[PDB]
Design a protein around this nucleic acid. Structure first.
Lengths: 248, 123, 130
RNA sequence: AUGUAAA
RNA sequence: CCCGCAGAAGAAGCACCGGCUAACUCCGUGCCAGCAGCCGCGGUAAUACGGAGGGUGCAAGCGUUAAUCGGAAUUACUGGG
């Protein structure tokens, strides 16, 4: 499938707990970079925001190549932070959380053609005031779309062909606005699917550091290595989920 | 004390309101039951509590907690609503009756089967 | 034929009574599975538009527009004698369905299940009730 | 001046 | 209502088991799933979730829900400040 060969955008954001949470999120950048350098992937420092003791509030990035997306699609969800952190004077085990979104490429096929047939323009004199010329000759060149039903009006000035150019620029601007609004609502819906409420609820992956083990909810593994994941070499967490996802 | 003031103004017993505003003391109601979603509780709990906003048959908009393990609800399937608070969700003071109307009972339960509508194991 | 799926699901009691009221007839026999949804309409003919028109009365207000769901062959009615049907209920209790007049034949899915039912030997004085 | 969030 | 015939032959379920309040362990997850009338458990060795065994209580009924009163001397005249 060509959807598996696409690049990805990783969005690692902080959930509960601030910095303790931020540090956990920051490590994950190190996790997937050590995971990524074992294969030869490009990490894009597209977006980041710092935390008080290290670790990040919201980080957004591009990873390009040949086949980044499936792993990202699998990951989207929550991550537990169980640790004895550095920002503590009591020395207890505390929980925080982070959220990781995996977005596909969706390459921009923008600017469809204007299309003359589909939209009908009506030549009317126009409204306004002050000239002998104002009444006699038309200056309302309304552009009406056929497939969407939008009319652009630049009963604007002096003559009707500069008003045609103005009304076509308004058609192009309103097409671009109405398509990018749907895409930001289509990204937003996808973003919501990728990241829940951000709380300490279990979403498909945990991290248990004073125990030395990692539970996964779907296709869970009893690997207490955490260490392998920490400097790349996870394969063992991602592969059996793919194995019993290809069965469905 | 001061019994002459009790002669003037009579000693009034407090009329405590009911814990469930259920329209003149009913055991159960039957509502439209939309909006099935999970809710984060108050402080010492941390769970995904399944809840439903039940538009009742008398106009009241109550929200009842969905108990048990697994359900067949999607924006429809009118069910039965019983009283009783949950002490877990601020605003939820009702429960859902399993074994009642179109929501079936909980799958594979053996103990405590008068609640949650599970029949007797026939074997 | 196909089903009852209770469109406009409020006030289900008009079809839980009024079609069971029509279940005593020779043309219409309403069958009840255990899971309390997806009630079966049993017609001997093909045109079930009769019941759809009959769902527009004073005590009949549900539409129930039809689709395609496959149920193969007539639920051949048989009920066994005492001390024999108890284990028949206890072995496959998820594979029963109430009938018009409180009957439990086996379940109608295929000819192979009817062959297994004949292999099960329900020795009884046979009542057709059709 | 601050100093989260598990007896 | 009484007599005779066949064969123990046709007839037992429901709640609870941390404290209040009568009764204990094991296994599966592990602040996910869940229970709960209040304090509340579950963050990998749970007498508190689910299943099994066992026990307790009631009995053709058993639990839940809804209303009234007592406990509530938290509407005090008996019987508060």
């Amino acid at each position: 499938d060509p959807d598996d060969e696409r690049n990805a955008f990783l969005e690692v954001r902080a959930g509960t707990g601030g910095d303790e949470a931020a540090l956990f999120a920051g490590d994950l950048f190190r996790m997937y970079s050590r995971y990524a350098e074992a294969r030869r992937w490009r990490v894009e420092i597209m977006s980041a925001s710092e935390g008080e003791h290290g670790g990040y509030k919201e980080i957004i990035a591009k990873i390009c190549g040949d086949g980044v997306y499936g792993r990202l699609k699998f990951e989207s969800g929550g991550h537990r932070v169980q640790r004895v952190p550095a920002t503590e004077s009591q020395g207890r085990i505390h929980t925080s959380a982070c959220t990781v979104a995996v977005m596909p490429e969706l390459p921009d096929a923008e600017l469809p053609d204007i299309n003359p047939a589909d939209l009908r323009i009506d030549t009317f004199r126009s409204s306004g005031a002050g000239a002998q010329h104002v009444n006699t000759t038309d200056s309302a060149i309304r552009i009406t779309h056929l497939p969407t039903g939008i009319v652009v009006e630049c009963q604007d000035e002096r003559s009707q062909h500069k008003n045609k150019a103005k009304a076509l620029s308004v058609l192009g601007a309103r097409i671009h606005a109405a398509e990018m609004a749907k895409r930001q609502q289509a990204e937003a819906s996808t973003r919501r699917n990728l990241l829940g409420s951000g709380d300490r609820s279990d979403r498909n992956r945990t991290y248990n550091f004073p125990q030395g083990r990692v539970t996964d909810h779907r296709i869970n593994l009893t690997l207490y290595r955490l260490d392998e994941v920490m400097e790349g070499k996870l394969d063992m967490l991602i592969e059996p989920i793919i194995q019993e996802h290809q069965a469905d | 004390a001061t019994v002459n003031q009790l002669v003037r103004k009579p000693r009034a017993r407090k009329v405590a309101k009911s814990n469930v505003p259920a329209l003149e003391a009913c055991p159960q109601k039957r509502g439209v039951c939309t909006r099935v979603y999970t809710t984060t509780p108050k402080k010492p709990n941390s769970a995904l509590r399944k809840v439903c906003r039940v538009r009742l048959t008398n106009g009241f908009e109550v929200t009842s907690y969905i108990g048990g393990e697994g359900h067949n609800l999607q924006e429809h399937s009118v069910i039965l609503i019983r009283g009783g608070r949950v002490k877990d969700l601020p605003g939820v003071r009702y429960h859902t009756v399993r074994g009642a109307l179109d929501c079936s009972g909980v799958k594979d339960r053996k103990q405590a089967r008068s609640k949650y509508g599970v029949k007797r194991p026939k074997a | 034929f196909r089903r009852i799926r209770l469109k406009d699901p409020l006030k289900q009691k008009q079809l839980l009574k009024g079609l069971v009221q029509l279940s005593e007839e020779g043309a219409v026999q309403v069958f009840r599975p255990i899971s309390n949804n997806d009630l079966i309409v049993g017609a001997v003919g093909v045109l079930q538009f009769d019941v759809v028109v009959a769902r527009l009365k004073s005590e009949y207000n549900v539409e129930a527009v039809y689709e395609s769901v496959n149920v193969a062959t007539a639920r051949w009615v048989e009920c066994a004698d005492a001390k024999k049907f108890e284990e028949f209920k206890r072995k496959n209790e998820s594979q029963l369905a109430l009938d018009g007049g409180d009957n439990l034949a086996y379940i109608a899915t295929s000819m192979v299940n009817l062959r297994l039912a004949q292999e099960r030997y329900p020795d009884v004085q046979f009542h057709q009730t059709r």
